[PDB]
């Protein structure tokens, strides 16, 4: 079997259910990100030779700044740079940590992952996507006031396509979330399926799929961050 949709360490608080495994994975990713951030803050070298951590962080910042400048001037969207970079690093680390060999036997022949990519959980992707949705809608309201922005989004670039435009504002968040979830959820199944093979043959397809999943996770992080920057750019114009 595959036990799709199973969650471990599930608990209850304030009359609400929480998936302990996904919370743990998110906390681990956040800890890694914070550790890298503090490593950078310690090893900043304005005049000295930058360290690998500084090079990585500055590469991310440079790419995101270039994207924003191409879309909308930094002077108009300064916060979008930190938002996009944190989104990108969060998703990238979440996807990449799955490569580590945390898969074992479930005592019934069904594989169990000690660490599972949080993006495979609908709550994680929904949190990210809805936060971004609220963020750039608030930014658009701020640019075009509390009233002007709704008319602009409804009318879009051509007014007479107002209905379709409405659908767009519904499609942007959903497409932002589900996509990511899918691309990670699929992984959570592939490895599981590969686990059905005997070890002496299970090793190889697992290696191939995980090696490809590394690039898939990098691509997904890049796409999600780029589309976030892009939706911000759309929401803040005129």
């Amino acid at each position: 079997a595959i036990h799709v949709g199973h969650h471990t360490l599930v608990f209850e608080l304030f009359g609400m259910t929480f998936n302990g495994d996904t919370i743990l994975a998110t906390a681990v990713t956040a800890v890694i990100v914070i550790a890298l951030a503090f490593y950078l803050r310690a090893k900043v070298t304005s005049t000295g030779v930058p360290s690998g951590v500084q090079l990585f962080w500055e590469a991310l910042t440079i790419q995101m700044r270039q994207q924003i400048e191409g879309s909308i001037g930094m002077k108009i969207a300064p916060f979008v740079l930190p938002l996009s970079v944190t989104i990108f690093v969060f998703i990238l680390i979440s996807n990449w940590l799955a490569v580590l060999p945390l898969q074992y036997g479930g005592a019934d022949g069904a594989a169990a992952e000690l660490y599972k990519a949080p993006a495979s959980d609908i709550n994680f992707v929904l949190a990210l996507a809805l936060f971004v949705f609220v963020c750039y809608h608030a930014a658009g309201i701020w640019r075009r006031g509390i009233v002007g922005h709704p008319i602009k989004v409804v009318k879009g670039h051509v007014a007479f396509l107002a209905p379709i435009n409405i659908v767009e504002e519904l499609a942007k968040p959903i497409s932002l979330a589900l996509r990511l979830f899918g691309n990670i959820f699929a992984g959570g199944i592939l490895v599981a399926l590969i686990a059905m093979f005997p070890w002496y043959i299970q090793w190889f397809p697992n290696a191939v799929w995980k090696t490809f999943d590394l690039f898939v996770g990098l691509i997904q992080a890049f796409i999600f961050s780029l589309l976030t920057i892009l939706y911000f750019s759309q929401s803040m114009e005129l």
Binding site: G70, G156, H157, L161, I164, V167, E168, A171, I174
Partner: protein, 85 residues
């Protein structure tokens, strides 16, 4: 003596499967074609990216609108199956 609701909901599941199959085919291929246009324009005219992202996104909007209308109707089919007793 099959449960009428059982037949109805199985038919609804097959119908929604068709809805999303068609929607995904259309959306994927239309987005791919619009992207072909976009990358071609960027390669030929590097400075035209800003003036191209608008029409490309309008056409992508129409393409995605079709797909997500299909999404809404598939959700109606499976969760609020019309005609189900």
């Amino acid at each position: 003596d099959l449960d009428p609701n059982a037949i109805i909901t199985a038919g609804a599941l097959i119908g929604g499967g068709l809805i999303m199959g068609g929607g995904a085919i259309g959306a994927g291929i239309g987005d791919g074609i619009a992207g072909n246009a976009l990358i071609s324009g960027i390669a030929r005219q590097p400075e035209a990216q800003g003036r191209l992202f608008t029409p490309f996104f309008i056409t992508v909007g129409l393409v995605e609108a079709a797909y997500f209308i299909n999404l809404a109707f598939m959700a109606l089919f499976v969760f609020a199956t019309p005609g189900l007793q």
